[PDB]
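Q: Hi! New to this. If I give you a protein sequence and the SMILES for A1IPV, can you show me the bound structure?
A: Yes, paste them in.
Q: Okay, here:
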Amino acid sequence: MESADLRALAKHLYDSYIKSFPLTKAKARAILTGKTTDKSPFVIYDMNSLMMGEDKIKFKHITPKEVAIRIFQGCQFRSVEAVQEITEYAKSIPGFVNLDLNDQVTLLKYGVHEIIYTMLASLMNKDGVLISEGQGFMTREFLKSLRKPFGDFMEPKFEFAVKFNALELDDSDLAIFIAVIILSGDRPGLLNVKPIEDIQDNLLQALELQLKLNHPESSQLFAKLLQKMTDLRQIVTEHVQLLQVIKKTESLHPLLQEIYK
Amino acid sequence: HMESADLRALAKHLYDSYIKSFPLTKAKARAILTGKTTDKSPFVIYDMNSLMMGEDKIKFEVAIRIFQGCQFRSVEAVQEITEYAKSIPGFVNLDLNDQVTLLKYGVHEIIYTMLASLMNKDGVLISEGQGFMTREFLKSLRKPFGDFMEPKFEFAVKFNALELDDSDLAIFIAVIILSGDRPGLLNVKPIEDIQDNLLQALELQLKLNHPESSQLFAKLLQKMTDLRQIVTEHVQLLQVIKKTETDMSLHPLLQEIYKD
Ligand SMILES: O=C(O)c1ccc(-c2nn(C(=O)c3c(Cl)cccc3C(F)(F)F)c3ccc(Cl)cc23)c(OCc2cccc(OC(F)(F)F)c2)c1
Ligand SMILES: O=C(O)c1ccc(-c2nn(C(=O)c3c(Cl)cccc3C(F)(F)F)c3ccc(Cl)cc23)c(OCc2cccc(OC(F)(F)F)c2)c1
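A: Thanks. Here is the predicted structure of the protein with A1IPV bound:
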């Protein structure tokens, strides 16, 4: 591909990424660092501040239980929203809607988890995570200190995010990276791998040029970012095993179960 | 960042060490596998009696005996990879604990990678290439052993579709060893500095040697994902086997690597 076509693809994905997702990394960083002019987020650091944050912020999430469960269900509620946002974004990826419909379903099914982890890092620092489009901030130490298996379920997300954020990618970088994850030709059950790798080869070309122009000083950043797809594959399988352990230990309305299946 | 003439110098140096360290290259393995030759023809083991005939012909209970044949070559491979790693510029200058840590977690991923060179879809070379044992025979071993053999073939068929030669693999293997993300490393930065140079060398090598193969660099790094997951499955499968087979000891080299 000619470089001007790669740049056009990079911008097409950036513009769609801005429309699809509620809180960009650029805004998230201004909040976390405290450089923004907007109001300080509500901070949840323990039981009583969580209670006020629900009565203050309008948590649609569960808020119909026990605190560790309620938080867990808040992460699931937001993840369900993120899947729809990613599904919408994927449609803007040139070539995606022309794929066999079953393959589109399969690529989203196996990709959304890796993309959620990746984009969750945009909302985290070493001390906590933004919530509710940035109106709130809940501390890492509070999440890490939840009882039984919940504390150990939260912390791996921060340990990854802290590592991923040291690459210092911005939104224009992430927009292409996310597209590369979706167009993975090795997902189980794909019917027609060739046009998926064909598209990914083009996204990879655009990612490489984007990182060289946007980060001329960061050597082999392309490779370092692809190496992070190893971090992603491993933590997602670990994650699946942690949910399976939770289910066998911790009922919900059958309709709710369907929603979260 | 490096000048390209220095990157090519590193590519030749690593290919040269790889030829010196590893007994059976992919180029030789492919010549044996494709045949057309009379001198290099292997004896083929496809069942019990041909295996029994195999001792008197080549140098090679059956589920265990074959397993011990795989572990013997694995231990030799750890020795070969250790020798190779010492040739990687900068490696012997790292903190001694980090040298051990990089080998500890790197050898398995490299064994799988290089085992693919000895395989096609129908079986694997053995006894320095004098033999060939069929995939379906290995898959048909009893107990848990059959299902322990087959995943190695499932990876190899996919990896081999990249059509790397030895000069590519020499650099790829070096990149794997110098991973700064291994658990417990003391000084990550000097390791990442070496990997950046190797990555630069791999990228330029793949562009010159495989100019028609678009984004092969990226596709090869993506295979380092398959390797991380398949090594974990291997370890977990070995541990389950151990808890059943008391007539199985492991070489101290392998035994230490699996400890933690
Ligand atoms: O915006 C966003 O983009 C977003 C995206 C993701 C999360 C989030 N998901 N999550 C999961 O377990 C998870 C993941 Cl990674 C992938 C797939 C499926 C799942 C799940 F299905 F199993 F969940 C987390 C675990 C811990 C934390 Cl720290 C965050 C996450 C996210 O979390 C916002 C958040 C943080 C803390 C309290 C909270 O709920 C509250 F409002 F406080 F009650 C909400 C945001
Ligand atoms: O040369 C070589 O480079 C070489 C390298 C690797 C193997 C080989 N190892 N292996 C393992 O299980 C394994 C691995 Cl990956 C990593 C670490 C530890 C282990 C182990 F500790 F747990 F083993 C395999 C499983 C199945 C097969 Cl197909 C091959 C392997 C290799 O296998 C040669 C071989 C194949 C079949 C019969 C046989 O024995 C016989 F000659 F028939 F007697 C020898 C060669």
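A: The longest strand of chain B covers residues 123-126. Let me know if you'd like me to explain how to read the tokens.
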